[PDB]
Structure 1
Amino acid sequence: GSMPPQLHNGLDFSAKVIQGSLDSLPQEVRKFVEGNAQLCQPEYIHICDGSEEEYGRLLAHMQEEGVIRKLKKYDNCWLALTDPRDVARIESKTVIITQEQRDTVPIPKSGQSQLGRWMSEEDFEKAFNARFPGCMKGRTMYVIPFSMGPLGSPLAKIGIELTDSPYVVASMRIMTRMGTSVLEALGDGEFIKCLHSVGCPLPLKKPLVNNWACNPELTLIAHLPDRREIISFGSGYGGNSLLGKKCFALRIASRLAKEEGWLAEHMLILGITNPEGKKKYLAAAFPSACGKTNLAMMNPTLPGWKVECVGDDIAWMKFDAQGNLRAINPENGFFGVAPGTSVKTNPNAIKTIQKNTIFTNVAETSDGGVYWEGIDEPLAPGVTITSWKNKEWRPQDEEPCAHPNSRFCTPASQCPIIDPAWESPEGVPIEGIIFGGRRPAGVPLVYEALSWQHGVFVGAAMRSEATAAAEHKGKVIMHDPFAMRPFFGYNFGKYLAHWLSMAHRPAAKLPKIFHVNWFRKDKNGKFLWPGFGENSRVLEWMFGRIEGEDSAKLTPIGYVPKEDALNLKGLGDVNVEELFGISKEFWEKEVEEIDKYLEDQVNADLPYEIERELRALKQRISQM
Structure 2
Amino acid sequence: PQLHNGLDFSAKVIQGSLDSLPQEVRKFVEGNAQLCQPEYIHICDGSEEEYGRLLAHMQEEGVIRKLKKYDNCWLALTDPRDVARIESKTVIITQEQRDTVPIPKSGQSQLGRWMSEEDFEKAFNARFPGCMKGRTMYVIPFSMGPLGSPLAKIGIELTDSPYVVASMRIMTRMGTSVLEALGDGEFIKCLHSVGCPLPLKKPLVNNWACNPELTLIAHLPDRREIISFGSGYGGNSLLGKKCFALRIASRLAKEEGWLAEHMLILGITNPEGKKKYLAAAFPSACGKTNLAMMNPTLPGWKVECVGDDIAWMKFDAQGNLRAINPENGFFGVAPGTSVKTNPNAIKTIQKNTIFTNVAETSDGGVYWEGIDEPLAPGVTITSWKNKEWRPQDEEPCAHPNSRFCTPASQCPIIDPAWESPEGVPIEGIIFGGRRPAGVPLVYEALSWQHGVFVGAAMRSEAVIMRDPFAMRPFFGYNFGKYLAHWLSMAHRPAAKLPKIFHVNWFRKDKNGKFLWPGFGENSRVLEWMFGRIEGEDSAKLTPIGYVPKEDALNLKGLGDVNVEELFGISKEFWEKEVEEIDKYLEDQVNADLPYEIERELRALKQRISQM
How does the TM-score come out when normalised to structure 2? 0.99
Quote the offset at 1:51 in angstroms: 0.4
1:484-538 CA deviation, whole Å, 9 max, x = no partner?
Answer: 0000000000000000010111111110000000011111211111111000000
- CA deviation digits over 1:30-89, x for unaligned, max 9? 100000000000000000000000000000110111100000000000000000010000
C-alpha deviation, 1:253, in angstroms? 0.4
Question: Deviations along 1:530-587, whole A, 9 cap, x unmatched?
Answer: 1110000000000000001101111111000111110111111211111111111111
| 1:234-277 Cα distance to aligned partner (Å, 9 max, x none) | 00000000000000001000000000000000001100000111
Structure 1 segments (4+ residues) deviating >6 Å: none
Aligned with 1:586: secondary structure? helix
Farther-moved stretch of structure 1 (523-532 vs 334-343): 523-532
DSSP-derived class of the 2:58 partner: helix
Counterparts of 2:411 and 2:581, CA distance in 1? 39
1:383-415 Cα distance to aligned partner (Å, 9 max, x none): 000010001001111111100000000000000
Verify the 8 A CA contact 2:93 2:120 in the aligned structure 1: yes
Q: What displacement does 1:207 show?
A: 1.3
**C-alpha distance in 2 between matches for 1:99 and 1:347:** 48
Q: Tell me if structure 1 keeps the 8 A contact 2:139–2:159.
A: yes
Deviation at 1:615, TM superposition (A): 0.6
Distance 1:515 1:149 in 2: 27
Deviation string for 1:288-337 (max 9, x for gaps)? Answer: 11111110000000000000001110000111111111101100000000
The secondary structure found in structure 2 opposite 1:137 is coil
How far is the alpha carbon of 1:10 from its aligned partner?
5.3
Q: Is 1:496 the counterpart of 2:492 in the alignment?
A: no
**In 2, distance between residues paired with 1:534 and 1:6?**
68
Secondary structure at the aligned position of 2:475 is classed as coil
| Conserved? CA contact 2:448–2:500, under 8 Å | yes
On the 8 A contact 2:267/2:305 being kept in 1, the answer is: yes
What is the Cα deviation at residue 480 of structure 1?
A: 0.4
Q: Is the 8 A contact 2:266 2:293 kept in 1?
A: yes
In the alignment, the residues of structure 2 paired with residue 25 and residue 318 of structure 1 have an alpha-carbon distance, to the nearest angstrom, of 31
Q: Residue 111 of structure 2 contacts residue 475 of structure 2 at CA under 8 Å; is this kept in 1?
A: yes
Q: CA deviation at 1:6?
A: 2.7
The answer to whether the Cα contact below 8 Å between 2:135 and 2:198 also exists between their aligned partners in 1 is: yes
Deviation digits for residues 356-379 of structure 1 (CA, Å, limit 9, x no counterpart)? 000000000000000000000000
CA contact (8 A) 2:150 2:422 kept: no
> 1:310-325 maps to which residues of 2 (within 5 A)?
310-325=306-321
- Identity of counterpart residues, as a percentage? 100
| Residues 1:613 and 1:293: Cα distance change in structure 2 (over 3 Å) | same
- Report the alpha carbon displacement of residue 96 of structure 1 after superposing the two structures with TM: 0.4
Preserved CA contact (<8 Å) 2:148 2:421: no
Using the alignment, how far apart are the partners of 1:319 and 1:11 within structure 2?
Answer: 45
Range moving further from structure 2, 522-531 or 84-93: 522-531
Question: What is aligned with 2:381?
Answer: 385
Cα distance in structure 1, aligned partners of 2:544 and 2:312 = 29
Taking the aligned partners of 2:471 and 2:29, their CA distance within structure 1 comes to 32
Q: Give 1:154 deviation, angstroms.
A: 2.7
How far residue 11 of structure 1 moved from its aligned partner, in angstroms, is 1.4
Match in the other structure for 2:570: 583
Deviations 1:570-609 (A, max 9, x none): 1112111111111111111111100000000000000000
The TM-score, its normalising length taken from structure 1, stands at 0.97
Contact 2:292 2:308 in 1 (8 A): yes
For 1:468, the equivalent position in structure 2 comes to: none
Mind listing any 5+ residue stretches in structure 1 that lack a counterpart? 465-474
Cα deviation for residue 152 of structure 1 reads: 2.4
- In 2: Cα distance, 1:321 partner to 1:45 partner: 44
SS in 2 for 1:410: strand
Corresponding residue for residue 59 of structure 2? 63
For residues 463 and 218 of structure 2, the distance between their equivalents in structure 1, rounded to whole angstroms, comes to: 27
> How far apart in 1 are the matches of 2:281 and 2:107?
28
1:274 to 270, 274, 285: 270
- 1:197-252 per-residue CA deviation (whole Å, 9 max, x = no partner) reads 00000011111101100000100000001100000000000000000000000100
Unpaired runs of at least 5, structure 2? none
Task: Give the corresponding residue for 1:469.
Answer: none
Pick the aligned partner of 1:106 from 90, 102, 105.
102
For residue 268 of structure 2, give the secondary structure of its aligned residue in structure 1. strand
**What is the CA-CA distance between 1:7 and the residue it aligns to?**
2.1
What is the rounded CA distance, in whole Å, between the counterparts of 2:358 and 2:129 in structure 1? 34
Offset from partner CA, 1:446-485 (integer Å, 9 cap, x none): 0000111000000000000xxxxxxxxxx41111000000
* CA distance in 1: counterparts of 2:434 and 2:602, whole angstroms: 25
* CA RMSD, Structure 1 to Structure 2 (Å): 0.7
Partner-residue secondary structure (3-state), 1:571: coil
SS in 1 for 2:41: strand
1:156 Cα deviation from its structure 2 partner: 1.4
- Name 2:325's counterpart in structure 1: 329
Q: Is the 8 A contact 2:382 2:389 kept in 1?
A: yes
Partner Cα separation in structure 2 for residue 576 and residue 386 of structure 1: 44
Q: CA deviation at 1:286?
A: 0.4
2:567 and 2:150 map into 1 onto residues whose CA distance is 45
Which of 17, 21, 28 aligns to 2:24? It is: 28
Provide, for residues 333-358 of structure 1, a one-character-per-residue CA deviation record: whole Å limited to 9, x for no partner: 00000000011111000000000000
SS at match of 1:381: coil
Which SS does the other structure have where 1:116 is aligned? coil
SS in 2 for 1:239: helix
